[PDB]
């Protein structure tokens, strides 16, 4: 299913963006290293038009669904960050190449007791991380999911008070604000 190779945040009533937090615009957020947009768009690029359709004052939902719906050649007008510059760009959709990287990456248990784990992940650097949120719950079993957070400058956390010899699903989310970056990372562990 042809893809453009980048993610967008923002939109009127949307969940904001880490580039110009005051601006509800549509912003290029993550760009895939080997994909269609990688030598053309950058993080923080505000989309103002795509294939003739204005992205000014657009809702996030509609922006995603227009982008997904477009032919294969998508022509964008972006504003790049004084100061600002308006730029037209052509991006051709790709079948094609890649599963997207996870955010953060390389989640692992490095030490364990019967009821405690030290987990670590690779520090996510491409975008501002205000905190990491860690959740853990018993794998596919009737159990709620428990969660806590560590500062964005931390790359390990301890999970405590686990029941001994149970399977737990552990997820780590990189949060800019209340909401997190796409592709949060998960492992399971007995």
């Amino acid at each position: 299913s042809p893809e453009l190779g980048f993610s967008i945040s923002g939109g009127v009533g949307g969940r904001g963006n880490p580039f110009r937090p005051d601006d509800d615009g549509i912003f290029v957020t993550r760009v895939q290293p080997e994909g269609p947009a990688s030598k053309l768009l950058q993080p923080g690029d505000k989309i103002i038009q795509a294939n003739g359709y204005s992205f000014i004052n657009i809702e996030h939902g509609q922006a995603v669904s227009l982008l997904k719906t477009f032919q294969n050649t998508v022509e964008l007008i972006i504003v790049r960050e004084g100061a600002k510059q308006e730029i037209r760009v052509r991006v051709e959709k790709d079948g094609g190449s890649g599963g997207v990287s996870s955010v953060p990456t390389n989640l692992e248990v490095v030490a364990a007791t019967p009821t405690s784990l030290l987990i670590s992940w690779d520090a996510y650097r491409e975008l501002p991380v205000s905190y990491y949120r860690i959740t853990y719950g018993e794998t596919g079993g009737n159990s709620p999911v428990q969660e806590f957070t560590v500062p964005g400058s931390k790359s390990t956390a301890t999970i405590s008070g686990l029941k001994p010899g149970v399977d737990y699903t552990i997820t780590v989310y990189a949060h800019y604000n209340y909401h997190y970056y796409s592709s949060p990372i998960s492992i399971n562990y007995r």
């Binding site: 980048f6 993610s7 993550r30 997904k68 604000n177 909401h179 997190y180």
Partner: peptide
């Protein structure tokens, strides 16, 4: 919470 960004 939800993702702040969506892939296209």
């Amino acid at each position: 919470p939800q993702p702040v960004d969506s892939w296209v």
